[PDB]
Amino acid sequence: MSRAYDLVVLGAGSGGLEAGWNAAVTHKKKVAVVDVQATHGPPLFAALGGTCVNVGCVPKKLMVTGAQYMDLIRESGGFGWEMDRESLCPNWKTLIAAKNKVVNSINESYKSMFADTEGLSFHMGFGALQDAHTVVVRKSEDPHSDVLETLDTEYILIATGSWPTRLGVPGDEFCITSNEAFYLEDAPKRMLCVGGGYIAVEFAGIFNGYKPCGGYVDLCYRGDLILRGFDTEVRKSLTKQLGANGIRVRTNLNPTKITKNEDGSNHVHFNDGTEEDYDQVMLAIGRVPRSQALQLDKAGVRTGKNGAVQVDAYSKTSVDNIYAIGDVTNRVMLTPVAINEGAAFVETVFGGKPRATDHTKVACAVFSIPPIGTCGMTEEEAAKNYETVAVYASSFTPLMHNISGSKHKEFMIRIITNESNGEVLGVHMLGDSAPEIIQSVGICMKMGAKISDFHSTIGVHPTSAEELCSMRTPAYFYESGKRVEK
Amino acid sequence: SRAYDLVVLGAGSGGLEAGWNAAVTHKKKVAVVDVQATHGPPLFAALGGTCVNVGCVPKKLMVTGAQYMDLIRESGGFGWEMDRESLCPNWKTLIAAKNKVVNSINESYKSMFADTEGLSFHMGFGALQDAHTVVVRKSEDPHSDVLETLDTEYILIATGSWPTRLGVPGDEFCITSNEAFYLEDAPKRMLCVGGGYIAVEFAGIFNGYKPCGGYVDLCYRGDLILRGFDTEVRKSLTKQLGANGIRVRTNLNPTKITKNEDGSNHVHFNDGTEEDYDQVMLAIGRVPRSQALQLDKAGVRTGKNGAVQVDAYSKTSVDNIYAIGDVTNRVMLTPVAINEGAAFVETVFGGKPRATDHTKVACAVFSIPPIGTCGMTEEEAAKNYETVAVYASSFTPLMHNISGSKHKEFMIRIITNESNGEVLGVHMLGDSAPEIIQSVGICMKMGAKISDFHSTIGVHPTSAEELCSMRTPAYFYESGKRVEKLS
Numbered sequence: 002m003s004r005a006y007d008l009v010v011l012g013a014g015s016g017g018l019e020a021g022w023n024a025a026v027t028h029k030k031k032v033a034v035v036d037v038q039a040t041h042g043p044p045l046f047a048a049l050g051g052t053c054v055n056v057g058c059v060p061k062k063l064m065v066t067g068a069q070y071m072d073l074i075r076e077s078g079g080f081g082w083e084m085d086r087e088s089l090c091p092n093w094k095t096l097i098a099a100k101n102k103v104v105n106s107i108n109e110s111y112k113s114m115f116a117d118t119e120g121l122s123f124h125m126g127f128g129a130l131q132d133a134h135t136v137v138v139r140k141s142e143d144p145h146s147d148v149l150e151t152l153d154t155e156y157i158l159i160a161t162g163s164w165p166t167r168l169g170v171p172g173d174e175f176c177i178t179s180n181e182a183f184y185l186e187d188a189p190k191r192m193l194c195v196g197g198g199y200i201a202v203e204f205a206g207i208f209n210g211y212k213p214c215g216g217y218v219d220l221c222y223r224g225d226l227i228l229r230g231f232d233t234e235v236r237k238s239l240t241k242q243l244g245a246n247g248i249r250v251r252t253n254l255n256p257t258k259i260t261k262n263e264d265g266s267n268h269v270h271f272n273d274g275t276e277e278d279y280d281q282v283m284l285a286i287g288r289v290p291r292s293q294a295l296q297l298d299k300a301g302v303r304t305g306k307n308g309a310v311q312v313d314a315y316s317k318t319s320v321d322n323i324y325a326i327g328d329v330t331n332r333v334m335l336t337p338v339a340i341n342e343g344a345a346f347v348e349t350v351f352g353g354k355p356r357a358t359d360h361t362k363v364a365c366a367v368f369s370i371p372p373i374g375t376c377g378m379t380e381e382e383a384a385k386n387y388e389t390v391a392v393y394a395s396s397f398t399p400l401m402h403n404i405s406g407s408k409h410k411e412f413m414i415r416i417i418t419n420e421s422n423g424e425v426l427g428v429h430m431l432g433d434s435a436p437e438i439i440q441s442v443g444i445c446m447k448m449g450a451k452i453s454d455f456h457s458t459i460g461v462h463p464t465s466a467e468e469l470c471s472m473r474t475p476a477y478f479y480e481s482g483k484r485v486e487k
Numbered sequence: 488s489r490a491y492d493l494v495v496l497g498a499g500s501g502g503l504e505a506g507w508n509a510a511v512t513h514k515k516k517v518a519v520v521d522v523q524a525t526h527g528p529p530l531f532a533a534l535g536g537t538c539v540n541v542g543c544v545p546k547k548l549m550v551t552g553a554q555y556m557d558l559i560r561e562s563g564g565f566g567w568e569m570d571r572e573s574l575c576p577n578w579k580t581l582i583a584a585k586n587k588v589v590n591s592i593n594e595s596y597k598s599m600f601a602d603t604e605g606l607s608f609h610m611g612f613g614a615l616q617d618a619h620t621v622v623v624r625k626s627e628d629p630h631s632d633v634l635e636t637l638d639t640e641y642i643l644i645a646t647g648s649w650p651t652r653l654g655v656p657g658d659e660f661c662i663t664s665n666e667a668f669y670l671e672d673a674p675k676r677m678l679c680v681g682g683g684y685i686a687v688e689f690a691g692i693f694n695g696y697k698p699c700g701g702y703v704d705l706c707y708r709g710d711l712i713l714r715g716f717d718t719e720v721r722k723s724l725t726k727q728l729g730a731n732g733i734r735v736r737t738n739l740n741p742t743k744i745t746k747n748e749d750g751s752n753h754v755h756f757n758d759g760t761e762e763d764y765d766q767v768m769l770a771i772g773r774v775p776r777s778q779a780l781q782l783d784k785a786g787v788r789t790g791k792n793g794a795v796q797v798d799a800y801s802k803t804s805v806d807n808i809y810a811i812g813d814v815t816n817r818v819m820l821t822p823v824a825i826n827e828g829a830a831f832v833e834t835v836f837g838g839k840p841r842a843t844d845h846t847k848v849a850c851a852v853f854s855i856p857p858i859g860t861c862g863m864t865e866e867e868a869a870k871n872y873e874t875v876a877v878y879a880s881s882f883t884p885l886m887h888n889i890s891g892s893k894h895k896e897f898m899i900r901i902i903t904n905e906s907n908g909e910v911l912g913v914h915m916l917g918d919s920a921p922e923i924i925q926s927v928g929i930c931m932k933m934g935a936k937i938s939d940f941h942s943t944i945g946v947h948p949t950s951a952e953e954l955c956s957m958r959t960p961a962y963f964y965e966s967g968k969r970v971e972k973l974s
């Protein structure tokens with residue numbers, strides 16, 4: 002070859018590694034993977050494995066499974082599990098500790114992958130494009146810093162992911178993000194989760210589980226109803242159920258000023274003009290793509306909306322040899338997608354047989370308490386897009402919650418079909434095991450299954466999922482975008 | 488002509504569904520016979536069927552109770568500190584809280600018959616007089632007082648099934664699923680006999696509710712528990728019951744039982760061991776419940792232990808008489824009996840005929856941990872289809888590194904036909920396996936292929952996302968022979 006390495010991957014991400022690994026193993030290419038550190042934690046947070054492994058899907062989910070024990074301990078008494086309810090409070094310390102261990106052992110698990118894989122090489126620093134075939138690595142985030150390596154390559158892949166959006170407000174410095182939340186010293190007593198994204202909610206769940214006895218948690222959204230882009234009816238039942246679990250949801254209310262107090266605590270001036278004191282305050286505003294210092298303009302790769310790399314369906318950028326995936330594109334900011342985008346890139350480029358990722362009918366989930374599983378069109382956007390649609394609903398309280406005493410925990414299902422053909426466009430579920438159920442739904446919808454296939458499949462009694470196969474007569478319809486009965 | 492357009496013998500999961508549908512969607516005059524209105528002994532079964540009163544409902548509640556044992560224990564790893572000295576639960580407050588819940592269904596159902604015109608409940612022992620008549624009697628003695636005499640166009644037999652006993656000296660001193668539900672106290676020293684889904688579910692329950700110092704033994708005459716399930720699933724489970732403290736015992740059934748001076752039950756074994764247990768449950772299985780209906784009076788046929796002889800549209804030996812659910816002995820699940828009984832209503836009363844699809848029925852075992860399975864076992868698949876490919880994947884969920892239950896391996900095993908890529912079977916052991924499998928059994932109802940499975944996008948992080956990563960078979964079968972690659 003004319004060059005040194007075949008591939009370079011900026012960012013050792015869920016998407017990045019998958020690509021880098023596959024190219025190196027199934028195609029034996031020489032592949033380098035750049036990231037900013039090897040083990041998780043501050044100051045950089047993200048590390049080997051990506052945002053999902055170090056400060057996302059893994060640690061998050063562990064804490065969520067921790068926070069659930071609050072309910073499950075409480076629920077147990079109804080089935081005759083008697084015990085000391087005076088020791089009401091958990092230990093945040095022993096959770097974070099136990100979490101770190103687990104996340105850490107992945108970073109180990111990955112180091113020895115690069116060691117064990119020939120072709121694959123990890124390169125710790127800040128990746129930056131020199132030109133279309135060269136990638137500078139630097140020790141410091143300052144672009145003028147010491148230059149650590151200079152990688153030469155046929156193809157470049159940008160899997161640098163995304164970074165928390167701040168709100169530019171007086172006192173922003175004193176707030177935290179998803180990233181900092183994971184390495185908090187102690188459990189916040191008086192907590193304020195700002196925003197209404199899936200992060201905002203997941204975390205409100207977590208802190209509400211791990212609050213010290215006497216603490217409370219406030220959610221705070223500028224809009225009307227939390228989690229836009231989800232089935233409104235699901236969003237409401239959830240907004241209630243967070244309430245029922247003790248999360249004080251607050252709407253049409255964002256803060257305007259934050260000021261640190263003489264005892265360390267954070268004082269918050271609000272939208273309406275309220276003043277309040279919280280130990281911590283987290284910003285789940287969202288995530289901007291992480292392209293802001295890579296020097297894309299040096300190479301001729303294009304930025305669009307907040308650095309979103311400009312990319313076609315086969316993941317190719319402005320420059321022919323350069324590609325980009327996952328969160329930096331801003332197509333869909335989930336891992337399984339980024340993995341697939343990065344797998345498809347390897348078959349396209351190195352594997353001969355080209356292919357692009359199918360972004361329709363991607364199932365996904367929110368690990369709130371209780372959690373949501375959704376795949377497909379929201380009923381609002383479905384009736385607007387397709388001419389005639391039929392909306393099926395079903396809410397039931399599981400039989401067990403008569404005994405557990407959590408009668409607030411309504412399991413909900415909402416199927417949204419095209420009426421003409423009977424095809425399932427969307428399925429929306431709130432309740433425990435909704436993330437597990439939905440996956441297998443998203444397979445049915447990948448085939449484009451119809452409501453006939455759903456109800457006319459035999460049941461698995463007793464489950465929550467068996468109420469997919471009973472959904473027969475629509476609760477109501479839409480006729481040309483018009484909320485209709487007939 | 489007739490005073491009822493249909494009589495149901497047995498207010499069952501299948502029965503009610505049929506009786507309700509005929510009465511409501513078709514406005515027929517329908518009577519439903521059962522032996523009582525509320526749950527409990529001596530009869531156990533009541534309004535709602537075996538599932539509602541002494542099956543899927545109470546069982547599942549107890550299972551959800553028994554889980555709390557693990558979940559309490561597991562919580563400590565995530566920093567849930569508390570008094571572990573009070574190690575033991577309260578069986579009494581569980582049974583109590585269970586009864587309430589099952590009871591409120593029996594209420595829920597009484598007022599259905601009240602609120603539904605056409606629908607009428609008739610408490611007694613149903614018995615065929617002839618092809619159009621159904622005698623109701625107060626006592627189980629066939630010669631007893633005659634309470635009603637129902638006349639009808641069509642008769643449906645949804646009388647379900649009854650626990651198989653083992654004819655052994657001391658059988659009287661044992662219990663069944665039915666009695667288990669109304670036990671006074673939690674058995675300390677317990678012996679679950681057999682290796683059916685009941686046997687296992689219950690071993691799970693008693694092991695959760697044992698007093699501190701008690702133990703639970705499982706006991707099967709065969710090699711490996713739960714025949715008819717994926718062998719590799721059956722083993723990982725047999726280990727995991729062990730790991731939870733259930734002492735599994737194989738090639739060992741008892742031969743004599745004798746009650747002791749302090750009430751307890753003493754058990755002579757297959758191998759010749761002697762042991763003492765507080766209670767001993769028999770999950771041998773369930774024979775159809777046709778043994779006193781006088782089918783021979785009407786000309787309906789019995790076969791293997793009363794199994795009603797029935798065609799695909801659920802029609803029996805006599806044209807106007809039909810039978811469903813457990814009494815047929817096709818598949819002894821509720822969702823099936825419901826569908827068999829729904830299909831019967833469209834066939835007879837609804838004009839448009841239809842028969843129930845017994846292939847690719849998903850189902851589950853609520854062990855701890857539970858199984859979800861739909862389709863062919865790998866053994867029977869390779870024997871039946873020429874070339875098959877078996878995909879496997881066992882992982883330990885990320886959380887069990889912290890909870891300290893590292894024994895809890897979530898397992899998945901897909902079994903395909905290799906020629907076409909079609910998914911014949913899917914087998915899952917682990918928490919949320921029953922919820923996941925339902926949505927699988929929809930894919931397999933369409934006859935989905937392994938291409939559709941792996942090439943669907945993931946829902947990270949779940950157990951179910953490891954269905955959409957299953958790409959290269961661990962091994963194959965070529966004309967019934969265990970092999971890696973072919974020809």
Ligand SMILES: Cc1cc2nc3c(=O)[nH]c(=O)nc-3n(C[C@H](O)[C@H](O)[C@H](O)COP(=O)(O)OP(=O)(O)OC[C@H]3O[C@@H](n4cnc5c(N)ncnc54)[C@H](O)[C@@H]3O)c2cc1C
Nearest residue numbers: 012014015016047051052053057128162327328334335339
């Ligand atoms: C709190 C949180 C929770 C989440 N939860 C879920 C969930 O439950 N389910 C789900 O499906 N998805 C979840 N996600 C989404 C998931 O993390 C991402 O969508 C996915 O990892 C995107 O892949 P990517 O390769 O584009 O970025 P990532 O996989 O995140 O890779 C980013 C990597 O690039 C490196 N990098 C960035 N810039 C540079 C540079 N200049 N030089 C060198 N290296 C660099 C970083 O150090 C990092 O390791 C979550 C995200 C967050 C933040």
Ligand SMILES: Cc1cc2nc3c(=O)[nH]c(=O)nc-3n(C[C@H](O)[C@H](O)[C@H](O)COP(=O)(O)OP(=O)(O)OC[C@H]3O[C@@H](n4cnc5c(N)ncnc54)[C@H](O)[C@@H]3O)c2cc1C
Nearest residue numbers: 497499500501532533536537538542613647812813821824
């Ligand atoms: C412990 C246990 C657990 C179970 N768990 C599950 C599970 O988790 N999932 C699942 O799918 N299935 C389960 N089953 C199976 C389920 O209970 C039955 O297979 C199902 O209810 C069959 O429906 P059916 O209408 O045929 O009969 P059933 O619903 O069993 O109907 C029986 C009814 O008929 C009545 N009857 C009996 N004799 C007469 C007569 N001579 N005259 C009038 N009425 C009569 C009885 O009083 C009874 O109420 C379980 C069974 C048991 C015993």
Ligand SMILES: CC[C@@H](C)Oc1cc(N)nc(Sc2cccc(Cl)c2)n1
Nearest residue numbers: 222223224225226252253254255272
């Ligand atoms: C009931 C709807 C009626 C009050 O109209 C509403 C309601 C609402 N919450 N926000 C608006 S406009 C709006 C948009 C973004 C942020 C905020 Cl605080 C308000 N209009």
Ligand SMILES: CC[C@@H](C)Oc1cc(N)nc(Sc2cccc(Cl)c2)n1
Nearest residue numbers: 168196197223224229255285286287
């Ligand atoms: C202009 C708003 C900008 C600073 O970003 C913000 C501000 C805010 N209060 N909440 C969010 S999160 C958010 C709020 C409403 C709807 C949706 Cl979809 C997201 N983003």
Ligand SMILES: CC[C@@H](C)Oc1cc(N)nc(Sc2cccc(Cl)c2)n1
Nearest residue numbers: 460462463467471500538539543821
């Ligand atoms: C097909 C679902 C339908 C039976 O509704 C449900 C769901 C559920 N979890 N429990 C019940 S109570 C119930 C009534 C009759 C038979 C059985 Cl097995 C259960 N009904």
Ligand SMILES: CC[C@@H](C)Oc1cc(N)nc(Sc2cccc(Cl)c2)n1
Nearest residue numbers: 652653681682707708709714740771
């Ligand atoms: C109880 C009658 C005896 C002869 O037969 C037994 C004995 C026993 N321990 N378990 C059962 S139930 C059972 C045993 C093996 C395979 C299967 Cl599929 C079921 N039947």
Ligand SMILES: CC[C@@H](C)Oc1cc(N)nc(Sc2cccc(Cl)c2)n1
Nearest residue numbers: 707708709710711737738739740757
């Ligand atoms: C392949 C091992 C070889 C001994 O075959 C085996 C093993 C076993 N446990 N039981 C049998 S026959 C058998 C069937 C029912 C009950 C009993 Cl105790 C034995 N054959």
Ligand SMILES: CC[C@@H](C)Oc1cc(N)nc(Sc2cccc(Cl)c2)n1
Nearest residue numbers: 880881882883884885886949950953
């Ligand atoms: C046979 C492969 C099986 C063990 O899967 C593996 C392999 C491995 N090295 N780490 C894991 S850890 C893990 C944690 C949560 C979910 C899943 Cl699917 C896996 N699983």
Ligand SMILES: CC[C@@H](C)Oc1cc(N)nc(Sc2cccc(Cl)c2)n1
Nearest residue numbers: 015053054058336948949952953956
């Ligand atoms: C792609 C492997 C995937 C299907 O298995 C799983 C499942 C799970 N719950 N956690 C993991 S750990 C992990 C490995 C790579 C990227 C990410 Cl985001 C997580 N792997």
